[PDB]
Symmetry: D2
Subunit: 102 residues, 4 copies
């Protein structure tokens, strides 16, 4: 009931309000990691694994498909274009080999 | 585009939403100063000034003025009751004087 | 090792730093309550109790009691000066009775 | 003597220091949050971009006829390691094809 309690407790609500905002801010910051794992997966991981499997199929003797995503504007596109140079080099060599048979 | 810009950029929306909540919290904290001035004026200043004015009126000879705030639970109630005792003492004094003057 | 983990986890430390600053901010905000209780008690409660106590002493018939804090510059000073007027009114009423009974 | 004339001012002013500390801590939180972007740019470049460009450069060398080019990053435990081991297999496969043709056309 006393003056000190009346005055001091009057700011308790406000402080909870401040804390509520801070908790929303903290939880939003906490979500960045899972979302970034997601982005990295779709943006980089998938394409890299795809390109790796493609390199492996080509090394194994499948030369029929142009390497996917050569059109991409970033370093994944650069990479994919380099693998296509490899595919074409292999394909010319195999074609010349086939011409030598018999 | 390059992958460093694509990935780094993907978190900018999140960071801005964190910042908005932080700014909101800081503004809410700043408002405590005003709110506390208001609470103090309501809880303390106004009743103390009301008692001071009442005291003055009694001292000037209105021995029947009503001393406000006597029922509050805090120290201001205690103060109001002590002012009511002064009023009573002055009434008793005046009634003794009138008897003497008879 | 996996690129999504490598990238996404690289920012966990920063995020925890941010969160730690938010905790420090919340903690410092909470401290305001106790500090405000203390301030209110020294600034307001103590002199209000001194005033009530003096008022009682005067009402109980010590018309010479010093009303404290008459020189204080804020509303406490206003109040104190009002109580001093009551005291002086009672002193006059006592002098007037003494004399009337002579 | 204290010049303060209003208890509402005295009480309210008394929490300003604390409040400014709260705000300063939140300013520093935001500043620390913003630094994330540039560190992330840097991690991506060091962890991903650099090895990818190296791998693409190495692929180009092999394709343009240096069948002995050393393929980097094959020991690496993530998906960059996987990609580098796939390009090392591709080299081995192109190398034998070229040699095969060379020998057949003698």
């Amino acid at each position: 009931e006393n003056i000190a309690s009346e005055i001091s407790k009057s700011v308790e609500g406000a402080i909870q309000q401040v804390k509520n905002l801070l908790t929303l801010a903290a939880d939003r910051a906490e979500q960045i990691v899972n979302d970034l794992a997601s982005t990295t997966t779709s943006t980089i991981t998938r394409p890299i694994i795809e390109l790796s499997n493609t390199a492996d199929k080509i090394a194994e003797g499948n030369l029929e498909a142009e390497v996917p995503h050569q059109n991409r504007a970033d370093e994944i596109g650069i990479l994919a274009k380099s693998i296509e140079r490899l595919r074409r080099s292999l394909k010319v060599a195999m074609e010349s080999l086939e011409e030598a048979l018999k």
